[PDB]
Amino acid sequence: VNQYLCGSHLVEALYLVCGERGFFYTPK
Amino acid sequence: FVNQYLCGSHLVEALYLVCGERGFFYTPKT
Amino acid sequence: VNQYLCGSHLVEALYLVCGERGFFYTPK
Amino acid sequence: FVNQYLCGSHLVEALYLVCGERGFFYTPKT
Amino acid sequence: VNQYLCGSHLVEALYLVCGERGFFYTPK
Amino acid sequence: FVNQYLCGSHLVEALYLVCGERGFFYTPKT
Amino acid sequence: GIVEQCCTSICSLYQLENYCN
Amino acid sequence: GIVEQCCTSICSLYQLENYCN
Amino acid sequence: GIVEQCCTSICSLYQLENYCN
Amino acid sequence: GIVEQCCTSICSLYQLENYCN
Amino acid sequence: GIVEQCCTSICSLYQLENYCN
Amino acid sequence: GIVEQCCTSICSLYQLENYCN
Ligand SMILES: [Cl-]
Ligand SMILES: [Zn+2]
Ligand SMILES: [Zn+2]
């Protein structure tokens, strides 16, 4: 549906649960 | 673009905004 | 579509890219 | 309403929330 | 429509307007 | 999960994220 | 609840204040 | 000044409403 | 306005910078 | 990817943790 | 106290789960 | 180091673009 709005929450949700491990963000 | 200290989820959201469809990497560890 | 949710991200995105210049926010 | 220091994007989002469809102005400069 | 995205803004909007009173958040 | 000080709306959004459909309570007062 | 009211139409601070403690 | 009123000093609902349009 | 342009399709920093002061 | 899984249905912390490093 | 446990002290996932319903 | 460049030091648009993919 609306990936740009969804993406912005995702990335906040990964920052919390990955912490010190970090992550990569690839919309593809 | 702003001239400030970007930390925690503010720094990630700045990344999300400026990298666009390239996406980005976030590796905070020392 | 859903301006209130969209609006909230916009205003965050203007605060970052306008910085010291600031902006006006008028939904009209 | 909260009783705290509002800064950066927290202050803008407070504005967005309290001005509603009036919209608002944000002029941070000294 | 999309409660998870909507929910995340709501809870931020309650934190601002309830302040010191706090709130309960029950999606039901 | 991150190892940091969670405050204001960052702490609420962490709650929102980790309690899922249970929902949660936020009672900040002393 | 607040989801079914504030996710469809928009709520104001005053409708929003109904959910506070 | 908004930063001055609400970021380095605290400001009530009535003081943030001065910045509405 | 910016709502009708940046809520439908996505805008970049450069389209976004049109709204600055 | 994570967009096509966590934007349609909701993901939990545990599905979400699949994307970490 | 939530502020006390997670804002002025640090708290793990298991400590934020005490505030769930 | 990203934290090092942008959190405890300040970094311009061109410096955050180094973290894009
Ligand atoms: Cl959203
Ligand atoms: Zn959103
Ligand atoms: Zn913050």
Swiss-Prot record, chains A, C, E:
Species this chain originates from: Homo sapiens
Origin superkingdom: Eukaryota
Phenotypic consequence of residue 21 to Q: In MODY10; reduces binding affinity to INSR; reduces biological activity; reduces folding properties
Covered residues, full protein: 26 to 53 of 110
Protein name, UniProt field: Insulin B chain
From Swiss-Prot, chains B, D, F:
Descriptive protein name: Insulin B chain
Complete-protein stretch covered: 25 to 54 of 110
Reported impact of residue 24 to S: In HPRI; Los-Angeles
TM regions (residue ranges): none
